[PDB]
Amino acid sequence: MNTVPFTSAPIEVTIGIDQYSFNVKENQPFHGIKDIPIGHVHVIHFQHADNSSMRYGYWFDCRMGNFYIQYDPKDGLYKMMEERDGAKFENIVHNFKERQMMVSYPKIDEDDTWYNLTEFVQMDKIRKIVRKDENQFSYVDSSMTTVQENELSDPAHSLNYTVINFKSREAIRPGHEMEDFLDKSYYLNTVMLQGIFKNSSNYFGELQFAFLNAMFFGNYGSSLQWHAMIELICSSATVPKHMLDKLDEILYYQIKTLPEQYSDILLNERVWNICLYSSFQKNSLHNTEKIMENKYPELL
Amino acid sequence: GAMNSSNYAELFNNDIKLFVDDTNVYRVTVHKTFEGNVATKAINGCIFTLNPKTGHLFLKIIHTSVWAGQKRLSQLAKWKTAEEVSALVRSLPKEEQPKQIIVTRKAMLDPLEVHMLDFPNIAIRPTELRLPFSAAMSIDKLSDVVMKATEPQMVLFNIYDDWLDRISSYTAFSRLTLLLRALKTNEESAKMILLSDPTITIKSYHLWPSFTDEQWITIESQMRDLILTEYGRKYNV
Numbered sequence: 299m300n301t302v303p304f305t306s307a308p309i310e311v312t313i314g315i316d317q318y319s320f321n322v323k324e325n326q327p328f329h330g331i332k333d334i335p336i337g338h339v340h341v342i343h344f345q346h347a348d349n350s351s352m353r354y355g356y357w358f359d360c361r362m363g364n365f366y367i368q369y370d371p372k373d374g375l376y377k378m379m380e381e382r383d384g385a386k387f388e389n390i391v392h393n394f395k396e397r398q399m400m401v402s403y404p405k406i407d408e409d410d411t412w413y414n415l416t417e418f419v420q421m422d423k424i425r426k427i428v429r430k431d432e433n434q435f436s437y438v439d440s441s442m443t444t445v446q447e448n449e450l451s452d453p454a455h456s457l458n459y460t461v462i463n464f465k466s467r468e469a470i471r472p473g474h475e476m477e478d479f480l481d482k483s484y485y486l487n488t489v490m491l492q493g494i495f496k497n498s499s500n501y502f503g504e505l506q507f508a509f510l511n512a513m514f515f516g517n518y519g520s521s522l523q524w525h526a527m528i529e530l531i532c533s534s535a536t537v538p539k540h541m542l543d544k545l546d547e548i549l550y551y552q553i554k555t556l557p558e559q560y561s562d563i564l565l566n567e568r569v570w571n572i573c574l575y576s577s578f579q580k581n582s583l584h585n586t587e588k589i590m591e592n593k594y595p596e597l598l
Numbered sequence: 599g600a601m602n603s604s605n606y607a608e609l610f611n612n613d614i615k616l617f618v619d620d621t622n623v624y625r626v627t628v629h630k631t632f633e634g635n636v637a638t639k640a641i642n643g644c645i646f647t648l649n650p651k652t653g654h655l656f657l658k659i660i661h662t663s664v665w666a667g668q669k670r671l672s673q674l675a676k677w678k679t680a681e682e683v684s685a686l687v688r689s690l691p692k693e694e695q696p697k698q699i700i701v702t703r704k705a706m707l708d709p710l711e712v713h714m715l716d717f718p719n720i721a722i723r724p725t726e727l728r729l730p731f732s733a734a735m736s737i738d739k740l741s742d743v744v745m746k747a748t749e750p751q752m753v754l755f756n757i758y759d760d761w762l763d764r765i766s767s768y769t770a771f772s773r774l775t776l777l778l779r780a781l782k783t784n785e786e787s788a789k790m791i792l793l794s795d796p797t798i799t800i801k802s803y804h805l806w807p808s809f810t811d812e813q814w815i816t817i818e819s820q821m822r823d824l825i826l827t828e829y830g831r832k833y834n835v
Contacts, residue, residue, distance in 0.1 A: 465708070465712060475677065475680070476712075479708070
């Protein structure tokens with residue numbers, strides 16, 4: 299179990315940690331989140347009471363360092379920082395616990411939700427999508443655009459998701475125009491999996507990371523990326539069986555966790571109806587199809 | 599963007615552009631089998647690729663052999679269309695390649711776009727106009743070269759005959775679409791109008807009769823009358 303202490307809470311903010319969230323009042327004595335499960339990535343995120351635009355937060359992994367939060371009154375936001383003095387950090391964490399000023403990561407033992415949402419997400423791959431190599435943790439917010447979005451402006455602040463484009467030379471072999479456009483198997487298996495991602499776990503990890511950024515920050519380019527990676531698989535006639543079964547589990551838990559009120563902007567009608575009902579893999583997502591129909595039959 | 603009544607004069611500027619109509623690429627007759635089931639028999643078709651400014655028509659004949667042993671032929675026809683249009687552009691010198699290709703049916707956009715990936719600066723555009731290019735096989739000389747073909751073949755025509763020696767592209771295109779609209783709505787009456795008078799002949803190297811200017815006025819009015827009559831009939835107006 300690990301801890302992320304907070305120096306203070308000067309402004310009223312809703313704090314999230316993974317799928318959980320707490321309201322903290324201006325200058326409320328709040329000093330951190332304890333009992334954070336080791337072994338997974340985590341995201342701590344913020345939405346100020348005064349600005350319900352710009353949700354923002356930090357992906358991190360406690361195995362990589364001692365991290366803490368501090369409000370910056372110049373930049374006006376809660377910043378994550380690393381403490382290199384291991385003794386000074388245990389000292390702060392112990393004194394704040396002694397004073398019981400820390401919330402406990404509220405995990406139910408039966409619950410594998412966070413594991414299921416982050417199964418393939420690795421901190422080292424996050425840091426290649428959010429490039430800021432002086433920090434071990436990664437900032438994401440509602441407004442950050444992706445590299446593909448930038449192509450159709452500040453590269454330091456971009457989400458470097460892998461570019462997927464069904465009408466590109468990369469996706470379409472000369473002489474196999476019709477075959478490759480209607481059956482993206484080549485694009486998925488040779489170009490993307492063997493070429494770029496190297497294996498299905500890295501692919502699933504980016505897909506899961508894209509979903510979580512869309513859910514937690516309403517990041518629109520992330521939502522586009524999540525749907526593109528689903529569509530690429532579903533529009534491929536030849537997919538490893540282990541990938542289809544794992545995709546069905548991944549999507550089930552994503553749909554399960556989504557806020558009902560957000561299904562309108564977070565779920566692309568065309569992609570889902572094509573994947574569930576038209577695509578090569580219409581019959582391979584039984585759990586995902588069953589939960590989509592019982593929870594969002596309108597979208598379909 | 600899409601082409602509509604508003605941006606209609608763009609067709610006659612000096613940016614090279616082609617219309618592609620795929621409506622006659624995959625043509626079948628439907629018949630009964632011995633067992634009483636229904637079957638199709640393909641006949642020869644054509645891609646209708648037209649430069650509306652110059653009248654140059656690239657009639658690519660689609661021989662029935664193309665379909666041999668293929669499934670989902672109506673879908674394949676769209677990709678074959680795009681393959682052939684793309685090969686046509688490749689065959690043209692750079693300074694003759696179009697800057698835009700306007701497809702008459704929106705289903706052609708993705709196939710042509712994919713086939714044209716090598717030409718990113720050629721814009722593939724849909725249209726909202728209800729162009730009558732399907733009636734191209736009502737033009738006797740075009741129907742004849744298509745049906746006689748024994749193999750894939752490209753045949754070039756000027757669909758405006760020599761009209762451009764006397765009228766502008768805009769007017770030439772209006773006449774062509776009027777003639778074709780009429781042929782589409784009532785082929786027999788349209789063809790009667792065009793050929794009634796035996797003294798007005800079709801040059802060997804033309805598609806339409808050699809009307810004088812005044813006779814074209816009379817023809818065009820007769821085609822207008824035809825089209826309005828048929829409309830009244832269709833809707834009981």
